[PDB]
Each structure stands twice: as structure tokens, then as C-alpha cells.
């Protein structure tokens, strides 16, 4: 996260750090708890991931230094990538991780609400991006989970900022015209969480952008409201 500040423990209890153990263990992507055996994240995270056996989901983490060999984690039973997904820049950048065991909810880890189909018309003004990503273009994964408040941008305004790309209505953009605050490398897959009527909703999934926090280059996110039926299809299967 560029231009953000340290989060407080328990501030974003749906936020997870997804690690890969191949070739060595490291943070791969962010993700969000949406159900007691489900993590919602970005499909591009899994480029070259041949098996869910190499994945570890850590919940209730503030600092990456909390993670050692003896730290508990959730194994991944299945990686479900949207079948229209080709690449982040073309959309459908959404995946579900079905966990091997159930997440016990509490003050350190709990799910975030998905948006309501009725709330596709609501105007969110309190949106935050979180993650352990870089704080500048050439950096390293941060120890402490960072946060930044960023305004949503209309699809029309985002399209002007991305000449040569097709910004679809299944994408949502966020950023300041002057730049300065944005997601950066290692934040992908994490949430764009918006507070409306005292409830937090998972509005976006960090997906792609041209650089980090540049002027007139907002971050592009998967527009979660457009995938609520896809999520329910995958999570509520008979």
C-alpha cells in the first residue's frame, strides 16, 4: 500500500495473507474471509500454481513476523478460478479458496459481507484498501498490515485514465486524480472494503493498475457486486 498507515490489530479481521511454500515460503497475495471455509481473492495470484498443496492461508495476522513454522494456518482443499478468466487486465479476476478446515470466528477473524444486488446503485464514500504490499515501486513486502482510504472513480473516468484498455462494468476503479494513495505489489487479491450504514462490504478485489499511486492512474479492482451469483453458485452448490 502506498501512502497508507499501519493498521491496528483486529481492524480488518476478514483480511488474510496467502502464502506459497514453493520454492520457499513467502506471502503471495491478500484475500478476504467470506464464509467459514471460503476465501475470496484474485485469479491472477495462481499463475503457475499447479496444486493447492503449496498454499497456506493465515488469518488473524497483523504482522508477517507472527508467522513461523509453528504458526497455525488453513490448508487449501480447492482453488476455484472463474472459467472466463484469461488475465487480470481482461477481467473475471476472481477466485475462491475452499479451506480444508473451518475458520472459528472471533474478534481476530471473521467474514466481511458481500455487497447486495440492490446496493448496486448505492454511493460508497468510505472505502479502504489494505495489504502487506510495497510502499513504493521498488520495495519489499511490509511487516505490518497497511491501510489507505481511497475514493471510488466512475467507470467513465477510469476509462479516460486507461486508453487502450477496456474498463468493463465488472471492474471498479479507485484512486485520487493526483495519485499518492493506492494498492501496490503484493496487495493483489486483498479487499477494497467500504463502510455503508455501519456495515463493511467487500466492494472490490485488488487486481491491477499502471504502476502504483501515479497521477491519473487509479487502481483497478474486480467489481464484487457483479459476481455475487457466481460466488453463491460455487459456495452454495447442492
Amino acid at each position: 500500500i502506498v501512502g497508507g498507515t499501519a493498521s491496528v490489530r483486529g481492524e480488518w479481521p476478514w483480511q488474510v495473507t496467502l502464502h506459497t511454500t514453493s520454492p520457499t515460503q513467502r506471502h503471495l497475495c491478500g484475500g478476504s474471509i467470506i464464509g467459514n471455509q471460503w476465501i475470496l481473492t484474485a485469479a491472477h495470484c495462481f499463475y503457475g500454481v499447479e496444486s493447492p498443496k503449496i498454499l497456506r492461508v493465515y488469518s488473524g495476522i497483523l504482522n508477517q513476523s507472527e508467522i513461523k513454522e509453528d504458526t497455525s494456518f488453513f490448508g487449501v482443499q480447492e482453488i476455484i478460478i472463474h472459467d472466463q478468466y484469461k488475465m487480470a487486465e481482461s477481467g473475471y479476476d476472481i477466485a475462491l479458496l475452499k479451506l480444508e478446515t473451518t475458520v472459528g470466528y472471533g474478534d481476530s477473524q471473521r467474514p466481511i459481507c458481500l455487497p447486495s444486488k440492490g446496493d448496486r446503485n448505492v454511493i460508497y464514500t468510505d472505502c479502504w484498501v489494505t495489504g502487506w504490499g510495497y510502499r513504493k515501486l521498488r520495495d519489499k513486502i511490509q511487516n505490518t498490515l497497511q491501510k489507505a482510504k481511497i475514493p471510488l472513480v466512475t467507470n467513465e473516468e477510469c476509462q479516460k485514465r486507461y486508453r487502450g484498455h477496456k474498463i468493463t462494468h465488472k471492474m471498479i476503479c479507485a484512486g485520487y486524480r493526483e495519485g499518492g494513495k493506492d494498492a501496490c505489489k503484493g496487495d493483489s487479491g486483498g479487499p477494497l472494503s467500504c463502510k455503508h450504514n455501519e456495515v463493511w462490504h467487500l466492494v472490490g478485489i485488488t487486481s491491477w493498475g499502471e504502476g502504483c499511486a501515479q497521477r491519473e492512474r487509479p487502481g483497478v479492482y474486480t467489481n464484487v457486486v457483479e459476481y455475487v451469483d457466481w460466488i453463491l453458485e460455487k459456495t452454495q452448490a447442492v
Binding site: 467459514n36 471460503w38 455487497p115 452454495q236
Partner: peptide
């Protein structure tokens, strides 16, 4: 949450 995820 209005949108319910089955346990």
C-alpha cells in the same frame, strides 16, 4: 450480512 454464505 443480507447475502448469506452457507456453513
Amino acid at each position: 450480512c443480507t447475502t448469506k454464505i452457507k456453513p
